[PDB]
Design an enzyme around this catalytic site. Structure first.
Site, PDB file in Angstrom:
ATOM      1  N   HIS A 145       0.802  -1.216   0.000  1.00 57.83           N
ATOM      2  CA  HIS A 145       0.000   0.000   0.000  1.00 57.83           C
ATOM      3  C   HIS A 145       0.838   1.271   0.000  1.00 57.83           C
ATOM      4  O   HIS A 145       0.303   2.352  -0.268  1.00 57.83           O
ATOM      5  CB  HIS A 145      -0.898  -0.008   1.242  1.00 57.83           C
ATOM      6  CG  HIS A 145      -2.121   0.831   1.113  1.00 57.83           C
ATOM      7  ND1 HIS A 145      -2.488   1.752   2.068  1.00 57.83           N
ATOM      8  CD2 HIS A 145      -3.075   0.875   0.157  1.00 57.83           C
ATOM      9  CE1 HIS A 145      -3.604   2.350   1.689  1.00 57.83           C
ATOM     10  NE2 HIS A 145      -3.986   1.832   0.537  1.00 57.83           N
ATOM     11  N   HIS A 149      -8.666  10.699  -0.660  1.00 55.84           N
ATOM     12  CA  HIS A 149      -7.866   9.489  -0.659  1.00 55.84           C
ATOM     13  C   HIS A 149      -6.609   9.658   0.193  1.00 55.84           C
ATOM     14  O   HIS A 149      -5.887   8.684   0.430  1.00 55.84           O
ATOM     15  CB  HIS A 149      -7.546   9.083  -2.112  1.00 55.84           C
ATOM     16  CG  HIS A 149      -6.912   7.735  -2.250  1.00 55.84           C
ATOM     17  ND1 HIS A 149      -5.548   7.574  -2.366  1.00 55.84           N
ATOM     18  CD2 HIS A 149      -7.447   6.490  -2.296  1.00 55.84           C
ATOM     19  CE1 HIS A 149      -5.268   6.286  -2.481  1.00 55.84           C
ATOM     20  NE2 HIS A 149      -6.401   5.607  -2.444  1.00 55.84           N
TER      21      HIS A 149
END
Ligand SMILES: Cc1ccc(C(=O)O)c(C(=O)O)c1
Length: 437
Positions: A102, A327
């Protein structure tokens, strides 16, 4: 400013809200340095798009893509990169199930030095278009002259900590970047690195990663103030994992416990979690498709309805970004009136045990499933006791640019968290559309 914290450019807001924002093309511009080689750590890539973001004169320099894809997904990424002979790939090992690579980071090697960018955006057009995303830009780090023996280390230990983060991959392509970092002077770095890497960490190694790493930094480099129980914790994220049957299983027992740490001495602290409501998504610049980048599944949400009483709307009037869905992921510790903060973290880590770690074996072992990376701003690293909150994000430079509004606003009684895999068919979005996943 000392902080070098930026938002990405947002299409469809007035230009004053992009004054001082950065697009990927700005980061890769020759104005930032004469590029020799780069590494792009990320989750998702559009390789054709990515290559076009590099200036033409830099477009054939080596690029390393660091990803976590396996099986068919790995084959698709290789097929994307195949037309570009200068692109190499590094598959980060994910040996614990349900883990993700990630981390979003650029390593940029120039003729003039080295830069590190730690950010929140995937390498696809949509992530840089109409979303709220965060970027930390390192200084230009000069090379240490050969024959000179110096550490090149900062007071925040950033050089050794970044090398340690890369060493955990056990990857030959990343050992090359470790050797590059060793040759550069990172002493000007004023942020602390907070990473997660997959593993089961025992003993002192627990303090290396995830929420125990944050806890250790706050214990060693922050101080507790009077009425500290009155200083809230704010977490702000784009995805939610399975946290357990109630708040005592992980959220308020170990996650919040680490985040409320201040100083070395040995809970009523308010916890505000900011996550877009359905209404926030429906009226956003993108409409319901913004929710494709807000992964919270109904299967997980229905197991933890207790969690949603902590949820607060996305609002970002301060940066003109209330309609640019987040985000970015951020965590911080404001004062009771939200006028000051004791620290600020921008990271890839969402509200998830996979990202932050969960204790196992009667609290002796911290298990992390994923790679994550962020940077922590502590007042002590700037000669300060606290940061003042910047009143308007784009308008003493000892003031930290918090990108969304304070205090956070609680969901209304009819609001619901955005859940990405159920339909929304009773009210059309900004573009006149319904959502049917
Ligand atoms: C479940 C999941 C997977 C990947 C990402 C990402 O890297 O964007 C996210 C996010 O951050 O919202 C969430």
């Amino acid at each position: 400013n000392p902080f070098q914290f930026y938002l990405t450019r947002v299409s469809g807001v007035k230009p004053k809200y992009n004054s001082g924002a950065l697009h990927i093309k700005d980061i890769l511009s020759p104005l930032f340095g004469t590029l020799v080689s780069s590494a792009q750590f990320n989750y998702c890539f559009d390789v054709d798009w990515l290559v076009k973001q590099y200036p033409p004169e830099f477009r054939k320099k080596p690029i390393l893509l660091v990803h976590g894809d396996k099986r068919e997904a790995k084959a698709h990424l290789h097929a994307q990169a195949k037309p570009y002979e200068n692109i190499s790939l590094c598959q980060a090992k994910l040996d614990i199930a349900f883990g993700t690579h990630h981390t979003k980071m650029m390593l940029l090697l120039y003729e003039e030095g080295l830069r590190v960018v730690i950010h929140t955006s995937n390498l696809i057009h949509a992530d840089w278009h109409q979303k709220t995303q965060g970027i930390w830009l390192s200084p230009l780090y000069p090379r240490i002259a050969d024959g000179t023996h110096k550490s090149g280390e900062s007071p925040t230990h950033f050089k050794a900590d970044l090398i340690s983060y890369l060493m955990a991959y056990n990857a030959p392509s990343l050992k090359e970047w470790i050797d590059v970092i060793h040759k550069h002077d990172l002493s000007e770095t004023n942020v602390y690195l907070i990473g997660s890497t997959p593993g089961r960490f025992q003993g002192s190694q627990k303090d290396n990663w995830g929420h125990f790493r944050l806890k250790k930094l706050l214990k060693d480099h922050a101080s507790s103030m009077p009425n500290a129980e009155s200083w809230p914790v704010v977490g702000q994220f784009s995805s939610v994992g399975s946290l357990g049957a109630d708040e005592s299983k992980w959220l308020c027992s170990e996650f919040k416990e680490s985040m409320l740490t201040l100083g070395k001495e040995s809970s009523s602290v308010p916890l505000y979690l900011i996550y877009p409501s359905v209404e926030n998504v429906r009226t956003s610049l993108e409409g319901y498709p913004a929710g494709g980048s807000l992964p919270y599944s109904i299967q997980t949400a229905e197991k933890q309805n207790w969690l949603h009483s902590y949820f607060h709307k996305w609002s970002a009037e301060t940066s003109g970004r209330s309609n640019a869905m987040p985000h970015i992921k951020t965590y911080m510790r404001p004062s009771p009136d939200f006028s000051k903060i004791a620290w600020f973290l921008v990271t890839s880590a969402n509200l998830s045990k996979a990202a932050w770690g969960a204790l196992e074996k009667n609290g002796t072992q911290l298990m992390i499933r994923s790679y994550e990376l962020g940077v922590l701003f502590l007042p002590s690293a700037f000669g300060l006791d606290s940061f003042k909150v910047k009143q308007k994000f784009f308008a003493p430079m000892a003031t930290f640019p918090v990108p969304y509004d304070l205090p956070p606003e609680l969901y209304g009684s009819k609001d619901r968290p955005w859940i990405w895999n159920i339909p929304y068919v009773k009210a059309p979005d900004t573009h006149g559309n319904m959502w049917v996943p």
